Design a binder for this molecule. Sequence first.
Ligand code: NAG
Lengths: 300, 137
Amino acid sequence: EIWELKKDVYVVELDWYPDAPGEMVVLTCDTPEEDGITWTLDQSSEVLGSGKTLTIQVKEFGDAGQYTCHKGGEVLSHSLLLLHKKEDGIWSTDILKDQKEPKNKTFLRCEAKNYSGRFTCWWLTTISTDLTFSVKSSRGSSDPQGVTCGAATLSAEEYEYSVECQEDSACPAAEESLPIEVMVDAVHKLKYENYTSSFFIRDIIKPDPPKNLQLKPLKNSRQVEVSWEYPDTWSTPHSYFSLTFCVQVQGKSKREKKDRVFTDKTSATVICRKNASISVRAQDRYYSSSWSEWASVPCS
Amino acid sequence: LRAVPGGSSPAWTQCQQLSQKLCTLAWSAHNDVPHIQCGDGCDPQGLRDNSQFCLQRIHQGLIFYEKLLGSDIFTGEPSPVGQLHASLLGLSQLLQPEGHHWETWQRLLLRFKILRSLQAFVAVAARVFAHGAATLS
Ligand SMILES: *[C@H]1O[C@H](CO)[C@@H](O)[C@H](O)[C@H]1NC(C)=O
């Protein structure tokens, strides 16, 4: 239950119960020699053992860290040990905050603006420090097909991290049969955790709001012609990747009139009234993915 | 130079309307399944060059689904399914050119899986027919 995460970083699977016996790990120095070798942990000069191997016990997050072997003053190799704690058949998820929206146990939320193969995932955390996130993705699992992700960076503030990914061989117009997999590694100090997300791009589609929303009053009437355009981030040609719209007219108050219209056109005629705003949002025409945020403009 | 008959045109406006209707119906209900894949010619560019490939693949998927909706899964255990089945047939009939012969419990779980998959397929079909109706005519 011990595997390499990256060069010189090893995850120890830790099954825990209050009277934990502790798992024994044997660490081997990465060297052609066996003489003059001592071991230290992290930034300490304290010798924890001699020779090419070190035998340690792991029970808690402090039992881990970067064990190092030395010969003649020189570092021979570093081995960083992280612990993945399995409470009782289930692995821990302290680092990421459940978003609780799509389903429960939803730590990663992904959305796409179009069918290009680019998407964004984000996640939330309480933690402000000692935090590293590593992101991997692919289409399919049997023979994974490439998806390239960037670095996970703090995006806003609760702490929000986002990552941008791009499918290498996108087929925007296809009917997807294998889902995209997203795998995020979460490291807080010496605590290692796994997060996973599976989906079709078609299902995480959320277009940007309608653009250039504008009003045009009728001569000596209350009626206004609402007009707008497709967002620039949306897939082209529009003749193929159609959108549909929801036009809303609403007051500031509670009991005031409301008006809500559905249309595949990029125009509508509504009745305006003082202190009402006209909102317009968008959704893929043929598939019931997510509505854009509202674009809106006051009846003024 | 000459001008030679190329055959009957696909019925783009009718197919556009039936495929749109199918999207509405498939969402009105909340393996080797055929999928419109990338090789299939249904992308915008693929449609100009040759739409017969795409349409022929769409026909295939339509008849696969109409067989599923007519099958034991939907007429056994405990609706838009009746109208969906009939519209699947209506569209497939429109795609069948003259001379061409293009024709060849656990249920509540299967029926959820089949309908979800149908939503995906009919959305692609709808885009094809809307694009063809708008740019080929
Ligand atoms: C995540 O953690 C579990 C247990 O440590 C492991 O089985 C799995 O391979 C890890 N995933 C990745 C993608 O590293």
